[PDB]
Design a protein around this ligand. Structure first.
Ligand SMILES: Cc1cc2ccccc2c(-c2ccc(C(=O)NCCN3CCOCC3)cc2)n1
Ligand SMILES: Cc1cc2ccccc2c(-c2ccc(C(=O)NCCN3CCOCC3)cc2)n1
Ligand SMILES: N[C@@H](CCC(=O)N[C@@H](CS)C(=O)NCC(=O)O)C(=O)O
Ligand SMILES: N[C@@H](CCC(=O)N[C@@H](CS)C(=O)NCC(=O)O)C(=O)O
Ligand SMILES: [Mg+2]
Lengths: 197, 198
């Protein structure tokens, strides 16, 4: 077991997928949460100047999904075949693309853009996901993968700004319930610092 | 496998897939659609986006998910599991930046404004970071070319159209482009491919 140190803000955000993975695999790690106020001099120290980063035995990794993928390699979270891994990867990038469209670090242009994405794109993404899932218990294959984790994670944040997101998609709510019922995840959820984002 | 790649008639987000097919000498249908046909095809797609790759009657989407799938167990994948993490990380950093550009913006003044801000204010910092990350090494990750090297060349070719002086202070990054373009399979694809601006 190597020594892990995750660095991010005190929020779920882009680090949370890494945090679910560690919790599910029961891998001990240091969950380092920096203060908004300290982000300047921290940022200048990093190779690509962004967080989260994951230090592994003195080697600094970056890019939340590159890290997530690395940590789930050779686990039951990866998806069984090379094809399934493609589906896991595609679903995760689809969710990530959409979340990336929101101007998180913007103030009056921010509200317009949020509503554009939540009123136009969101229902379309929801319908596409529901169709893609259709009937299966999990998003890829017959067991849980880190794509299901990411669905639960991204949808939790989207529901903050659009509470009715899933009112007409009970099958996508069922997937959220299934992720939250995993004892390791339920346990993390109750223990993690409560944040809006 | 019978492969059919569907995208616009441009390099764009499909080009990484095209480079991989060329390097591995794999046959595929390079299906290029017009804008006028786009409404009719869009409703058929899994998430309404292109590129998609059809494989023996099954549809894959997401260019980098597909790129990664195609390079699994080939020499374009990282040599180790951690190198594969470095490859993904570099690819996503490139894609992130490229994704900030409003490529589909129908208001040309807004588009041009956002393009100018990203190219003069943001691009130089990313070019510095990539150059520092490369250092004196031959390839971005490990001892040999990976699809991250392909994606650097693909993305920088497009960025150089709009900012020709992008790599003026980064000769080692320009040498990396030249090495990728010199790989025979890539060299011939650059000659074969339809000549488009983007
Ligand atoms: C679950 C998830 C997934 C995301 C995927 C792509 C992009 C952003 C994502 C986010 C996300 C990321 C960041 C924020 C977010 O609130 N960012 C602002 C950064 N703050 C730093 C401290 O000082 C104030 C500004 C909100 C949401 N969350
Ligand atoms: C190499 C590369 C990489 C990219 C990575 C992320 C996002 C966009 C990328 C692009 C890219 C993608 C799209 C465009 C682009 O020109 N998009 C416009 C889309 N259509 C408008 C209607 O007519 C048909 C074209 C330009 C560049 N290229
Ligand atoms: N795709 C990257 C994005 C990294 C990113 O842009 N993170 C934000 C925090 S949510 C950041 O560091 N932005 C602040 C800055 O650039 O200073 C990832 O998933 O890790
Ligand atoms: N991250 C995705 C992006 C897919 C995407 O947004 N592609 C664009 C074309 S470059 C698209 O389908 N947009 C047209 C539309 O939304 O109608 C990928 O790499 O495949
Ligand atoms: Mg991405």
């Amino acid at each position: 077991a190597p020594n892990y140190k995750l660095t991010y803000f005190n929020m779920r955000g882009r680090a949370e997928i890494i945090r679910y993975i560690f919790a599910y695999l029961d891998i001990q790690y240091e969950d380092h949460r920096i203060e908004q106020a300290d982000w300047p001099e921290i940022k200048s120290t990093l190779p690509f100047g962004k967080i989260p980063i994951l230090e592994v035995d003195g080697l600094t990794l970056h890019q939340s999904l590159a890290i997530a993928r690395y940590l789930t390699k050779n686990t039951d979270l990866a998806g069984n075949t090379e094809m399934e891994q493609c589906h896991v990867d595609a679903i995760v990038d689809t969710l990530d693309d959409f979340m990336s469209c929101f101007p998180w670090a913007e103030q009056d242009v921010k509200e317009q853009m949020f509503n554009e994405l939540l009123t136009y794109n969101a229902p379309h993404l929801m319908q596409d996901l529901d169709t893609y899932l259709g009937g299966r218990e999990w998003l890829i294959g017959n067991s849980v993968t880190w794509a299901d984790f990411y669905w639960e994670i991204c949808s939790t944040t989207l529901l903050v700004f659009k509470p009715d997101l899933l009112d007409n998609h009970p099958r996508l709510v069922t997937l959220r319930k299934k992720v939250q019922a995993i004892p390791a995840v339920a346990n993390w959820i109750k223990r993690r610092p409560q944040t809006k984002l």
